Symmetry: C2
Subunit: 154 residues, 2 copies
């Protein structure tokens, strides 16, 4: 049964990853992480540890990914909200590192899958990563009539 | 000329306010803050920004459509229509306490929620909520506010 998935490539900032986990828990979104993370996992610093999967590499995730993949990038020639999420597919939303983005070779192979969040680049060139995850996940939900919210048990 | 505005009621967490400022700068969104903030402004720790002594002072100066972002509104943020030429003000409560009790009741017809499944968490992070609410307005407005930096200035 089709659902939404967030895929973080080598997440570098702890606070962004904790906010993403919270958005995933709130939305019944699965979380996928490509190792290595840029930070140590500190038990004490931290409670609902949601559907989480780890992968050694992008290639590793790609052998196991089944459905529609969307690359979130700065320079895609398509806007996030113009993609159609209103189907029964699994949707995977892949986000680059805060500092480096996604590998440029991967972006090239998959360029037709890339979507951007438009910004005016006058003062800042980018939005905070966890902010982008939340809005991308909720745009998919919006088009899906928020049905993922109702389907925790299933 | 119609613009989007973010209004923060007594924001309490510095990292939230710094992220909101970034979103505002990226989107040509004006930022309004009801004093007092829960944290000191530290210049070494480091945009159209306005400050207000109180919700009342903001309400005397507010002109356009006001939307209260709350947990329990009987309307979904994305079902409000933002596709007009009005100023849209999006008012967000404190991270810890939300919006005042009496204000919410007085303005309950203006309230919108972001639906969540409350099984594991009851809320989303404040700055995440600002960013999505602003971009939902932009989406309905065909992203036009991105193009009007100089005109708004």
């Amino acid at each position: 049964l089709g659902r939404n998935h967030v895929v973080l490539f080598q997440p570098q900032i702890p606070a962004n990853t904790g906010n993403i986990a919270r958005t995933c828990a709130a939305t019944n979104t699965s979380l996928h992480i490509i190792r290595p993370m840029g930070f140590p996992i500190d038990d004490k610093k931290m409670y609902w540890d949601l559907d989480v999967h780890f992968y050694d590499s992008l290639n590793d995730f790609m052998n196991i990914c089944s459905g529609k993949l969307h690359l979130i990038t700065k320079f895609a020639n398509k806007t996030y909200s113009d993609e159609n999420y209103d189907d029964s597919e699994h949707h995977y939303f892949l986000f680059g590192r805060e500092d480096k983005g996604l590998p440029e070779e991967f972006m090239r192979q998959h360029s037709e899958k890339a979507l951007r969040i438009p910004v005016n680049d006058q003062h800042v060139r980018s939005l905070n990563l966890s902010n982008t995850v939340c809005m991308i996940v909720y745009e998919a939900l919006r088009q899906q009539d928020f049905i993922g919210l109702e389907l925790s048990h299933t």
